[PDB]
Symmetry: C2
Subunit: 205 residues, 2 copies
């Protein structure tokens, strides 16, 4: 019996990889898949140190100690209290209070940069421990949040908010699968094979 230690972003684990995790479990009954979640920085360190076999992390891929594959396109949605007018540019919500998922620095920085590009700013940023909590604050009328569409639409509360994608250069991010630079192990190759049988559906129309 072997061990495949896979790290993942919270959002990816929630709405992108469940089907692949089940398939891998059933395909390789003698491999123990150990799934952990955390921030990209921490996971990358775990992959580099050998504590993780691979991890789903925020792009872009820049660390020379890693190799990787771009896997999931995420559509970044600005989320507001119910019935709010479509938000198409940051000046329209200048000074608004913002709620961010603490563990995903890349999404927070992206949201901030979107404000700054239109010479606007959030009034303040509140770091939150969960997507459900973040969404509940928006539902309650407290401010705005930036959440991938895939994650947003999986949460019941999406019925109680209004959401729109960010404008083109800010609309899409990419979640990568990364591993330690070098020949892939048989287990990782096996995992990528099962994963690929799905990401054709995710990227294709």
């Amino acid at each position: 019996q072997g061990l495949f230690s896979l790290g993942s972003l919270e959002s990816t684990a929630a709405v992108r990889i469940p089907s692949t995790l089940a398939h891998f479990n059933q395909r390789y009954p003698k491999i123990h898949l150990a799934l952990s979640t955390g921030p990209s920085g921490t996971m990358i360190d775990g992959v580099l140190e050998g504590a993780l076999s691979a991890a789903f992390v925020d792009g872009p891929l820049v660390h020379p100690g890693l190799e990787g594959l771009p896997v999931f396109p995420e559509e970044m949605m600005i989320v507001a209290p119910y019935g709010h007018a479509p938000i198409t540019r940051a000046s329209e919500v200048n000074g608004a209070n913002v709620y961010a998922f603490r563990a995903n620095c890349s999404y927070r920085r992206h949201f901030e940069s979107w404000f700054h590009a239109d010479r606007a700013t959030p009034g303040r940023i509140h770091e939150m421990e969960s997507y459900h909590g973040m969404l509940a604050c928006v539902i309650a009328g407290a401010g705005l949040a930036l959440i991938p569409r895939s994650m947003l639409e999986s949460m019941p509360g999406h019925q109680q908010v209004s959401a729109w994608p960010l404008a083109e250069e800010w609309r899409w991010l990419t979640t990568w699968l990364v591993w330690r630079r070098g020949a892939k192990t048989r287990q990782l190759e096996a995992f990528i094979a099962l994963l690929n049988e799905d990401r054709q559906t995710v990227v294709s129309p």
Copy 2:
């Protein structure tokens, strides 16, 4: 403009109160609803100290510094890797690895007690920071978890697990709304009124 500081369990915030939060936001535009999440013990302390106006917490209600209302019935589901035979008693899964939501001690203790009642035990308990992460470990074949049906069925991964309710005396728990003992404030009375227009649907068939 006033402030209503409401604490809530993660699960309750995810799948029980979104509609009520939106209604309260729209009904009282001059009240700022500040929604926080955390473990019951911490929230109760916040209510007692005056940091929170009220909180949704795990029952039963025993602290004499509080008054409260029983609100949501939660059906406790044992969750296993896909296709697993129905689990009706703990001896059937004696020694299994268990995944628990770190913040909800009451649900962890409940699960442990369910094992012990049948002279069984989990092999070990792994504390997890999120329901999605907990569910992903089960999907991956790593063990079992105890999750309220309302929460479970809201997560996409529920399609990749098999789940059954615990047997009668272990099947149902109750989430309470609690506040500091004394006359309720006008805001709390107002919140309870909007809440009551919904919990008839939650409890009734």
